[PDB]
Every structure is written in structure tokens, then in C-alpha cells.
């Protein structure tokens, strides 16, 4: 269900608002200015937004005919963009509840928002239109925009009405004198949780205690918080460290476990239930990027399955904040709530108290609950102690939410919240790793013992049986270049970005490349042969290594498939030995034919790697030239990598007729097999014709010289 957006400008703010609501809703958008509408009998776009609807009115007439034809044949709706009251009888209303520009006398439209936003009926021209008067600044306009995307795709681009709010009270028992609570604030906190249990079912506050700085303030405040020792059954609690200290500053698992065990002793002596699988780091230190010892010490002494951070994948914008299941702990995005540690009074809020009243009545709070199914809110003790700011913000937030939305607001315990989060978003179960040094806030979150820039600058992708390990060796000969360490059984393959090794993490990948120094070479590389045909490898490789270079070599795909077939014949694999090559071109036969022929389709893999990496970073050679004259092609690689010093490869690469190749790895790269049969060569020349044609057009598109075998296959 791709959705096509037609922005008026690339820097237009309404395009950022519409794309912002679509990225907050995880709806897969297509950015375009002022194209092909179908993809071989299936619709390419499920919904259209014009950010300027006058583009559609003044459209090209043939293209308008194709647009209206594609809309009526596939049921595609168009969203337009040029006090406020909600229509109770409107079919647009799915999330919006009726509580507290465009004029047509003929009944051909539904006035959903009445002064603004209307829903034109589908029977006028076969297409459905939802038209917007103003932009997406008011919160009711964003509410009816979510309802507009919901109805026009037939609830395909929508979310369920069940909505989930977790409220964390961080910084409990941490403040100095004048910021902590007394008996009045604890009693008002319990009374507020009674009324919010009346509003939201099982709304119980989650409290981030710190046990060291309890019993150290005012004894009147300590007797003021002694009534919270009588109030333990009616409150949820999560550990927020003993001394509110950042977990990456410890950089030892054991002393962090002693701090968490001191908070565990505090939880036992208070009457706190040692349950619920939830805890949050103080400055979110160690959650993204992953400090392994925080994740290990969390589940060791607390059974943490859920944490929540705002650091993934970046701190700002909050629309991009995803969750990820790494190291057995299902991380969730955290939300800011508008409440901070410096806010202790209603009067001393930044921008006045009215700015808080915009944040409650339609700010980051309300669009956070509307656009996210799971919303974990951060509040601090200073918002509960003097003017009771968090009591104010949630007594007004759930009143606003139950007034204007018909959402099923339920507070489950955070294990059920994390299970619901990864049931709704199953694509976010895999983490997407990024560079810790690239964002300096993440580097502050990253531990100081971990050395920066331990990553490759070149990716020698495959495919297999082409000559990639000889190119790996010859790039290893250069003093300015340093090869990767061998990764145990897989050797010079790390197979990080394509397999299950991506779930091991950044620090597993960083161990193969040592610490940069004056003695060690700066430029680093790995040969990664399975990353060619893999679909998951280029996007993750562009995520972690944005400025890396891509080096592919390509030989004749009939001979590549033949050498791959003889490679599994020489590895004594039973299906490839059992059937001859004519039968190849059971499930093992189909798997062998798929990994023998889909690696031969060079264009479909170079499209993925070119969608990830820039074509300046991608360079393609001949491969047979690596067997005939390798010094000129190695001079071309040395010009490609941008190195300063240059090795004269004419004199150090010596031809060996005893091996048949310029030197080498001996028997494994010097195999001698009988030549391909003539009927098999006719079948494999006939099938590798169209793949060679789009391959030749692709290599002319890339600004690359075409190989020899491609030119004789194009001529014959």
C-alpha cells in the first residue's frame, strides 16, 4: 500500500507535515514533484495526496485521463490541500468522537469539519476526494487527516482504536530540598490515580525510584514521602538506578549490577514488587548505541524484557523513533511529554504556562497518542512536588483524549505493551545499526573506552566464483590498505549485513577491524561475496557505512553459473553431484538452481546496491581481465579508491603458467573441470540474453565500461 505524495516544493512545509504524519503512522510514502501509475496489472499507489491540489486541477489532460482511469480502475482516492465543529453523521469519523471554505448546495460532499475539511462523494466521477481548507497546524486538522487516510483506503491505511499509554514518573527520590514531595502531593497523587483509573482502565503510575537519595533530604519531606511507604500496592514501580548515574560511565557490568542490586535491596525494604520487566536508564545512556553490559545487567538482576529510550535511531525528530528487539530486550520509543526537571511550578514553564496548555490540548502529547499505538511518557518528580505538574498534564490529557477521541485508552503492564508494539510493527523487530561517532549525542551515550572509527571504507561485494578473493589478496598487498581479520570458519567473509550476524551488534562487527593509529592503516575493507544477491545486505550496509565504497566484479553469467555449479561439485554437495547441469538449469534442486542462477542476474542485485550506495562509490570490472592482464585493472582500482601512494602493479604481479593465473589460493581457486556441454551452453546462452541486455544498459547507465564477454554476447 504505497502512497504517492505530490509536494509543491521539496522544502515546502505542508509536505513536511503530511510526510511527518505518514512517517509517524509508518505509512510507506513516495516523494515526487509534478509518472508511471501501474506495475504490470497491480496498482503502484494506494492513495494520492496533492500537497497543492491546483496541480491536479491544472494537470496535463492526457496525464489527468491516465490518473482518473487508474483511480477508477483501482479505487484510489485523492487528498487535496488548499469555529471548527465535528459532524456526528460523517463516514470519515473512525477515531474522532463528536464533542465540544467549502460550500456546496448540492449534496455531493460530506462536511466532516464545519466552520473546514470535507469528504467529496465517490459517485461524481468514480473517484473519492477529501479536501482540506487550511494546512496541518491545528490538532483537529491532523485528527481529520488521520481519519481521511483511514477511510479512503478502506481501513488498510489505518490503526486499531485500542490505544495504549504508559506513564513513567522518573527521578523519584532524587531531588534536593524544595523539589521533593510532602504528604499533600502523595495524597493528591493517589487521588489523581483514582480518577485516572476511573478514566483509563488499569492506569497505574510507574515510578522511577532512586534509593540512595531517599531518607537524605528534609525529614519533613521524608515523613512526607513516608506515606508512599504505606501506598505501595496502588503504584507500579520501575528501577531508575541507585544514584541516578549514567550506565555507560560505569563501563563494567559488575559494578552496575551492584548499583542495581542496591536499588533491589531498596525495593525489598520498601515493599516494592520486584516485577513488571521494565526499567529506564537516567540519560538513556547505553540503550542506543548498545552498551552490552547495561542490557546484560538489566536482565540479570531485574528480569528486564522492556526498556524505553528516545535515542533510537536518532534523538530528534520524535516521529522517527522506532523500537527494536535486541539482546532479548524489546526496546520501545520514549516520548518527551513536555515535562522536564527544571519545571517545578506552573508559572516558571518555558514560554509560560500557555505553552504547556498547547502541549496538553493538541501538542506533542495528543498527536503522540493519536499517531502511535503505544505511547510511553516521561515525567519527573519536580512535576509532582510543588505545583503538581504531571497530575495537571494527565488529568487534562485524558480528559482531552476521552473528549475528542473515541479511542480505547487502556494502560497495560509494559510487557503486554511491548508485545502489542511488536505485534503491530513486526518490521521493527530487526534493529538497524548506525554509526555511534556520526551523532555526537550518541557518542556521549557511547562509552569512552570504545575506540571510534573501527569500520571499513570499502565493501568488496561478490558474487561468488568470479575472482573476488584474488582481488582481496591484491588489495591486501597495498601498504595504504588494510584487510579485515578472518572471521573463524567464514574466513575473510564476516557475513554481517546479510545474515543472522546483524543481530550480534556493532561491537561484534567492530572486533574484526582494530584500533586506528599511526601504525595501523586508515583504509579498511572486507570481501563480502554473499552480499551481492542478498536483499537485506545493502540497506543495512548503507545504514552503518554511508561513505563506504562498493567493488563488484562480473564475469560471463553462463560461465559464472557453471563455475558455481562446479564449486558445489567440488565441495561434495550431494544434490549438485547427483544431477547433471542440464537437469539443474526436490527442494534442494530448486535451492541449488536458485543460488546458481539468481546470482547470475547481475542487474537485479546492482539495482539494490545502487539504490543503497551512490554510483560514484560503485565500480565494476571485467573479471576475465583479472586472469589476462591484472595490473591495468589494479591500477584502475587504485584510482578508484582515492589513495595517495601508488603501487606499480606491473612489476610485482608475476604470471604463472603452472597455475594458469597471475599470482593465489592454490587448489580452491585453481580448479580444472570439463567444459560445458553444447546443449547446456545453448540453454544457458538463450536464458542469459535479456539479463545481459538490461545488464549492458545498466552498465552504460552507471558510467562504467562494458566487459568483453558482454560485448561478444551483445554482438552475437
Amino acid at each position, epitope marked *: 500500500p504505497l502512497v504517492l505524495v505530490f509536494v509543491e516544493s521539496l522544502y515546502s*512545509q505542508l509536505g513536511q507535515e503530511v510526510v511527518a504524519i505518514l512517517e509517524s503512522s509508518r505509512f510507506k510514502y513516495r516523494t515526487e514533484i509534478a509518472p508511471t501509475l501501474t506495475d504490470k496489472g497491480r496498482g503502484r499507489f494506494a492513495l494520492i495526496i496533492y500537497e497543492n491540489i491546483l496541480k491536479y486541477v491544472n494537470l496535463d489532460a492526457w496525464n489527468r485521463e491516465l490518473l482518473d482511469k487508474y483511480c477508477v480502475a483501482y479505487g484510489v482516492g485523492i487528498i487535496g490541500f488548499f469555529d471548527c465543529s465535528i459532524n456526528p453523521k460523517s463516514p470519515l469519523l473512525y477515531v474522532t468522537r463528536p464533542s465540544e471554505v467549502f460550500q456546496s448546495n448540492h449534496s455531493t460532499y460530506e462536511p466532516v469539519l464545519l466552520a473546514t475539511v470535507v469528504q467529496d462523494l465517490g459517485l461524481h466521477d468514480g473517484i473519492q476526494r477529501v479536501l482540506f481548507g487550511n494546512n496541518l497546524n491545528f490538532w483537529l486538522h491532523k485528527l481529520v487527516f488521520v481519519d481521511a487516510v483511514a477511510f479512503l483506503t478502506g481501513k488498510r491505511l489505518s490503526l486499531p482504536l485500542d490505544r495504549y499509554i504508559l506513564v513513567d514518573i522518573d527521578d523519584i527520590f532524587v531531588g534536593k530540598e524544595g523539589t521533593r514531595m510532602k504528604v499533600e502531593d502523595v495524597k493528591a497523587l493517589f487521588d489523581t490515580q483514582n480518577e485516572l483509573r476511573a478514566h483509563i482502565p488499569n492506569f497505574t503510575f510507574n515510578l522511577g525510584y532512586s534509593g540512595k537519595f531517599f531518607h537524605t533530604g528534609t525529614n519533613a519531606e521524608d515523613a512526607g514521602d513516608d506515606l508512599l511507604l504505606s501506598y505501595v500496592k496502588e503504584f507500579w514501580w520501575f528501577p531508575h538506578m541507585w544514584s541516578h548515574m549514567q550506565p555507560h560511565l560505569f563501563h563494567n557490568q559488575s559494578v552496575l549490577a551492584e548499583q542495581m542490586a542496591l536499588n533491589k535491596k531498596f525495593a525489598v525494604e520498601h515493599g516494592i514488587p520486584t516485577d513488571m520487566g521494565y526499567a529506564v536508564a537516567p540519560h538513556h545512556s547505553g540503550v542506543y548505541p548498545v552498551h552490552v553490559q547495561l542490557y546484560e545487567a538489566w536482565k540479570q538482576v531485574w528480569s528486564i524484557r522492556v526498556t524505553s529510550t528516545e535515542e533510537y535511531p*536518532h*534523538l*530528534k*525528530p520524535a516521529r522517527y523513533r522506532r523500537g527494536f528487539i535486541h539482546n532479548g530486550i524489546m526496546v520501545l520509543p520514549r516520548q518527551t511529554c513536555g515535562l*522536564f526537571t*527544571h*519545571t*517545578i*511550578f506552573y508559572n*516558571e514553564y*518555558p*514560554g509560560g504556562s500557555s505553552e504547556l496548555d498547547k502541549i496538553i490540548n493538541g501538542g506533542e502529547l495528543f498527536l503522540t497518542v493519536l499517531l502511535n499505538p503505544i505511547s510511553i511518557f516521561m515525567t519527573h518528580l519536580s512535576n509532582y512536588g510543588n505545583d503538581r505538574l504531571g497530575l495537571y498534564t494527565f488529568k487534562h490529557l485524558v480528559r482531552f483524549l476521552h473528549s475528542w477521541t473515541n479511542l480505547r485508552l487502556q494502560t497495560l503492564p509494559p510487557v503486554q505493551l511491548a508485545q502489542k508494539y511488536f505485534q503491530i510493527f513486526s518490521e521493527e523487530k530487526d534493529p538497524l545499526w548506525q554509526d555511534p561517532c556520526e*551523532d*555526537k*549525542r550518541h557518542k556521549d551515550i557511547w562509552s569512552k573506552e570504545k575506540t571510534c572509527d573501527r569500520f571499513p571504507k570499502l565493501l568488496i561485494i561478490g558474487p561468488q566464483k568470479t575472482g573476488t578473493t584474488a582481488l582481496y589478496l591484491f588489495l591486501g598487498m597495498h601498504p595504504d590498505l588494510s584487510s579485515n581479520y578472518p572471521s573463524s570458519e567464514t574466513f575473510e567473509e564476516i557475513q554481517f549485513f546479510n545474515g543472522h550476524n546483524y543481530h550480534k551488534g556493532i561491537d561484534w562487527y567492530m572486533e574484526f577491524f582494530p584500533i586506528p593509529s599511526n601504525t595501523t592503516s586508515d583504509f579498511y575493507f572486507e570481501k563480502s561475496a554473499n552480499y551481492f544477491d542478498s536483499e537485506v545486505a545493502p540497506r543495512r550496509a548503507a545504514a552503518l557505512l554511508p561513505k563506504a565504497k562498493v567493488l563488484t566484479i562480473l564475469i560471463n553469467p553462463a560461465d559464472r553459473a557453471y563455475s558455481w555449479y562446479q564449486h558445489q561439485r567440488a565441495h561434495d554437495d550431494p544434490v549438485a553431484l547427483k544431477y547433471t547441469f542440464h537437469e539443474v538449469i526436490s527442494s534442494k534442486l530448486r535451492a541449488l538452481q536458485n543460488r546458481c542462477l539468481v546470482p547470475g542476474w547481475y542487474a537485479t542485485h546492482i539495482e539494490r546496491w545502487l539504490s543503497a550506495y551512490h554510483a560514484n562509490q560503485i565500480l565494476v570490472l571485467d573479471g576475465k581481465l583479472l586472469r589476462t592482464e591484472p595490473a591495468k585493472v589494479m591500477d584502475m582500482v587504485q584510482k578508484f579508491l582515492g589513495v595517495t601512494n601508488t603501487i606499480d602493479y606491473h612489476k610485482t604481479l608475476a604470471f604463472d603458467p603452472k597455475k594458469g593465473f597471475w599470482c593465489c589460493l592454490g587448489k580452491s581457486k585453481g580448479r580444472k573441470y570439463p567444459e560445458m556441454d553444447l546443449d547446456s551452453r545453448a540453454f544457458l546462452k538463450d536464458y542469459y540474453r535479456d539479463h545481459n541486455i538490461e545488464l549492458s544498459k545498466l552498465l552504460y547507465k552507471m558510467g562504467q565500461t562494458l566487459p568483453t564477454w558482454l560485448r561478444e554476447d551483445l554482438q552475437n
Partner: nanobody
Amino acid sequence: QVQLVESGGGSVQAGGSLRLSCAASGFNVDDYAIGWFRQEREGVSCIGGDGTTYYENSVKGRFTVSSDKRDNTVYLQMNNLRPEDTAIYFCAADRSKYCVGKYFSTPSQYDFWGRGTHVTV
């Protein structure tokens, strides 16, 4: 209480220099982003918590933002002043002190703002 107070105004009308002082009362100025926004709001400058400095292309050879920890005040030493520069300059605080080049111009990146002061060029 986080408060941002700014000052500085006028110019030599064909082009001159100023040092707009944004005082950060109630919090530390080396812990936040303190990016300057001119009027919608355009983020022409940003000064990171380690001192890392970003500009737009109109202001890249001209403006010089700076920071001083001692009076807790971020300064904007302006130079070679074009008539397009006249606006309301907003020193805005952000929890991420370090600036990123995609988002140091966005007003949605910056949480707590200032009163704003006018430069007339």
C-alpha cells in the same frame, strides 16, 4: 526555570557588525544547542556543546557565532551585513546540544525559545 534573554539591535545601514548576546539564565549554555533562528523561522546558525559550528550558505562567510561559559552567554559576532539579514533573531534551546546539518535549520528541532530581538539593516 529555563529562560533565554537576548539583546542587540541596529546596524550600519549599508553594512556593519554586531554581537548579539543571548544570556541563558537558570540553566547552562554549554549543555544545549542555542541555535539562532531568524524570521517562518530559519536556522542560520548553531553552536554545539563541544563548540562545533554550523552555518547556512548565505551566512557561511559572514556570521561568527561563539559561546562563553563564564557569563553563560552565547554571542553572535555578525559581519559584512546584507539588507536581507533583518529579522527577529531567536536563540532557541534544544536538549541535543550537538547540531546536525539536516536539522539545525528546523524550528521543530528546538524546544525552548527566547523573546527575540530585532536587527534593522
